[PDB]
Amino acid sequence: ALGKLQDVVNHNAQALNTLVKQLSSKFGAISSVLNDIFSRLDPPEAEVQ
Amino acid sequence: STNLVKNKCVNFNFNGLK
C-alpha cells in the first residue's frame, strides 16, 4: 500500500550506499587508498595517482 | 614502535597503513 514513500526512501538510501561504495574504486590507479599512494610513490607519480 | 593511546584523535601508522 505504502510503496511510493518506501520507494523514495529506498532510492535515497541506495544512492548514499552507492556513493559510499564508490570510494572502493581504483579509477585506473594502483590503489584506492590515498595513504598507500603517499607511502609508496614519489610526488611526480603519486600526484598523478 | 610507540605506545598506544586510547580515546584520542591520532594519526597512526600500522605496518605501513596510515
Curated annotation (Swiss-Prot), chain A:
Changing D7N: In strain: Delta/B.1.617.2, Mu/B.1.621. Residues 6-49 form a coiled coil. Subunit of the fusion protein that is processed upon entry into the host cell. Mediates fusion of the virion and cellular membranes by functioning as a class I viral fusion protein. Contains a viral fusion peptide that is unmasked after S2 cleavage. This cleavage can occur at the cell membrane by host TMPRSS2 or during endocytosis by host CSTL. In either case, this triggers an extensive and irreversible conformational change that leads to fusion of the viral envelope with the cellular cytoplasmic membrane, releasing viral genomic RNA into the host cell cytoplasm. This is Spike protein S2'. It comes from Severe acute respiratory syndrome coronavirus 2 (2019-nCoV). The lineage of its organism: Viruses, Riboviria, Orthornavirae, Pisuviricota, Pisoniviricetes.
From Swiss-Prot, chain B:
This is Spike protein S1. Attaches the virion to the cell membrane by interacting with host receptor, initiating the infection. The major receptor is host ACE2. When S2/S2' has been cleaved, binding to the receptor triggers direct fusion at the cell membrane. When S2/S2' has not been cleaved, binding to the receptor results in internalization of the virus by endocytosis using host TFRC and GRM2 and leading to fusion of the virion membrane with the host endosomal membrane. Alternatively, may use NRP1/NRP2 and integrin as entry receptors. The gene is S. Binds to host ACE2. RBD also interacts with the N-linked glycan on 'Asn-90' of ACE2. Cleavage of S generates a polybasic C-terminal sequence on S1 that binds to host Neuropilin-1 (NRP1) and Neuropilin-2 (NRP2) receptors. Interacts with host integrin alpha-5/beta-1 (ITGA5:ITGB1) and with ACE2 in complex with integrin alpha-5/beta-1 (ITGA5:ITGB1). May interact via cytoplasmic c-terminus with M protein. May interact (via N-terminus) with host bilirubin and biliverdin, thereby preventing antibody binding to the SARS-CoV-2 spike NTD via an allosteric mechanism. The chain holds residues 530 to 547 of 1273 of the full protein.
